[PDB]
Amino acid sequence: YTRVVWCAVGPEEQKKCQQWSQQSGQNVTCATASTTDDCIVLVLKGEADALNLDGGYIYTAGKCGLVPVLAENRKSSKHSSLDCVLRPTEGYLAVAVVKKANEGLTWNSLKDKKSCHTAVDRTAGWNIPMGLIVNQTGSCAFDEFFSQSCAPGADPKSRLCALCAGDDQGLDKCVPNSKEKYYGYTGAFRCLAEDVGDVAFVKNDTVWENTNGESTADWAKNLKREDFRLLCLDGTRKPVTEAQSCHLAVAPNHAVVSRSDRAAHVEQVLLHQQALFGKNGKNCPDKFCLFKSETKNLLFNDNTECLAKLGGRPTYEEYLGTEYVTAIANLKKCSTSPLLEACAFLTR
Ligand SMILES: *[C@@H]1O[C@H](CO)[C@@H](O[C@@H]2O[C@H](CO)[C@@H](O[C@@H]3O[C@H](CO)[C@@H](O)[C@H](O)[C@@H]3O)[C@H](O)[C@H]2NC(C)=O)[C@H](O)[C@H]1NC(C)=O
Ligand SMILES: *[C@@H]1O[C@H](CO)[C@@H](O[C@@H]2O[C@H](CO)[C@@H](O[C@@H]3O[C@H](CO)[C@@H](O)[C@H](O)[C@@H]3O)[C@H](O)[C@H]2NC(C)=O)[C@H](O)[C@H]1NC(C)=O
Ligand SMILES: [Fe+3]
């Protein structure tokens, strides 16, 4: 079985993956599920092989035995010309973000406001913010800390899904895939933009990429960096350029995961795949661009140069950073989920 079956979360991702299968002559094939958690289960069953994952999902899969194959990697300023696949990863910034126009809203007045989150269990969208809010307030009731949210993946009869828009017909509110208008990085920031929420937790890179003519997408052509601000943990606010000084935390980059018995096959298949279709591969754009989704972030984030190598053969823990595994761990004392419970024994 040479083919690497890839896991597409949601129908929009499934289409780009069907495309990739066709271009790759079945070097890659598609399986899908509605959610990432579901996909992780296919990867476990052996029904799929691999998929690229936010660091928080990496911890879920990590727990269930899956391991990290190659990290997503983006442009760089520091050391900005060693080869992409061997150049170390620099992480990204998880930020709290607001309309500038609104005032009196700051980290310390967040309680009882309205939130837009990438989706539940994700790193910047969720794990970091809710992480801190737990440590600070000192209670496990983050489900009630904000007045309402969009938090795809949460309980959809609950308040954390109260603000989610669903798709075009409004079907499937709160399903944590790209058919939910406010899903993921782009989704969250848009939930902010349309004033459905007060704060939105995202990465620095997400505001720059959807303001000031960078997206030519109806919801975001006219958006202006000026109209937004970043809450720091100071109590303070700064514009988006000071993100380095105004960020909640540093996050580990998305990364591909698979089963260990499938890691090397997958890593190799992918390295060739990116050479074919990656940022500067033979066939991109003449044929297929693996890293472009028109700002919809499918399979991969659109600002990925290449998938890069990892020091040794790490585990979720080496890969994520021991500092983060604890932040996630401690947040997770306040809530259970099917997959961590079902897999808890593997890692005891
Ligand atoms: C589908 O998968 C295979 C990966 O197994 C790709 O075929 C392999 O492609 C390399 C080209 O990178 C083939 O030739 C190479 O030639 C250079 C010399 O110019 C040499 O340095 C290499 O050692 C190698 O001989 C290689 O033979 C080939 N393997 C097979 C079994 O065909 C193919 O590109 C993939 N196709 C798509 C659409 O992704
Ligand atoms: C937050 O995210 C934004 C966007 O991801 C970052 O801005 C980007 O910064 C890089 C360099 O740090 C820019 O690339 C540069 O391009 C010029 C040529 O135009 C070149 O001379 C430099 O050597 C470098 O390659 C990139 O264009 C820029 N993108 C945009 C749309 O502004 C920003 O750095 C991030 N902020 C923090 C604090 O990390
Ligand atoms: Fe993330």
Swiss-Prot record:
Residues holding Fe(3+) 2: 54, 92, 185, 254
Localisation: Secreted; Cytoplasmic granule
PTM characteristics = Poly-N-acetyllactosaminic carbohydrate moiety seems to be needed for TLR4 activation.
| Disulfide bridge partners, by residue number | 7-39, 17-30, 64-343, 84-306, 116-191, 140-334, 150-164, 161-174, 232-246, 284-289
The glycosylation sites annotated in the UniProt record are 27, 135, 204
Provide the binding site for hydrogencarbonate 2.
118, 122, 124-125
Superkingdom is Eukaryota
- Boundaries of every Transferrin-like domain copy: 4-333
What does the subunit section of this Swiss-Prot or TrEMBL entry state?
Monomer. Found in a complex with LTF, CLU, EPPIN and SEMG1. Found in a complex with MPO and LTF; interacts directly with CP, allows Fe(3+) incorporation into LTF and activation of CP ferroxidase activity.
Please explain the role this protein plays, according to its UniProt record: Transferrins are iron binding transport proteins which can bind two Fe(3+) ions in association with the binding of an anion, usually bicarbonate.
**Family under the similarity heading:** Belongs to the transferrin family.
| This protein's name | Lactotransferrin
Q: Which organism is it from?
A: Bos taurus
Taxonomy of origin reads: Eukaryota, Metazoa, Chordata, Craniata, Vertebrata
**Gene name in the database record:** LTF
Span within the parent record: 361 to 708 of 708
